[PDB]
Design a protein around this ligand. Structure first.
Ligand code: AGS
Ligand code: MG
Lengths: 48, 96
């Protein structure tokens, strides 16, 4: 079943996951948008 | 081997052949037979691994002949290594 799903593409292979994790770690470092900041500042103070 | 394994009572005969110097401990001998024969270790699709050998713990009051069972397994198994915790004249379990 895992082989069939990996042929399908709903699950990707472990070595390919490792190489993709390395690629995303070296290439991408996202920033939060300013419109994404006030929601965290509200959803963090409501817990407190 | 095929001729003797074709017999219906091969498993009970193997269990009875376990440790002839040991008397009356059929359950221990059965566990020893499972540990000596072992199962199938399986690595499915590389990611998930399942152990395929039986680990047996003989917890007993002293004088119940656990040591003689261990020496029988040592004489019987292909690669059996004896180790002890309290004693010193043995191969250590820690790598060094
Ligand atoms: N069911 C049994 N059949 C045959 N011999 C037995 C049986 N139970 C005990 N013995 C004998 O009792 C003695 C026990 O010695 P060991 O097995 O070396 O000690 P032990 O059973 O490991 O217990 P410890 O080491 O004090 S925790 C041996 O001489 C055995 O042969
Ligand atoms: Mg002992």
């Amino acid at each position: 079943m895992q082989n069939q799903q990996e042929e399908n593409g709903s699950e990707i292979s472990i070595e390919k996951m490792k190489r993709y994790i390395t690629y995303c770690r070296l290439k991408c470092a996202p920033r939060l948008s300013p419109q994404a900041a006030e929601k965290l500042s509200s959803n963090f103070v409501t817990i407190r | 081997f095929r001729k003797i394994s074709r017999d219906r009572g091969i498993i009970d005969k193997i269990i009875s052949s376990m440790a002839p110097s040991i008397y009356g401990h059929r359950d221990i001998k059965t566990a020893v037979a499972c540990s000596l024969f072992g199962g199938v270790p399986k690595n499915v699709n590389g990611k998930h691994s399942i152990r395929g050998d039986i680990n047996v713990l003989l917890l007993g009051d002293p004088g119940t002949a656990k040591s003689q069972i261990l020496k029988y397994v040592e004489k019987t198994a292909h690669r059996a290594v004896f180790a002890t915790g309290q004693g010193a004249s043995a191969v250590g379990l820690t790598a060094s």
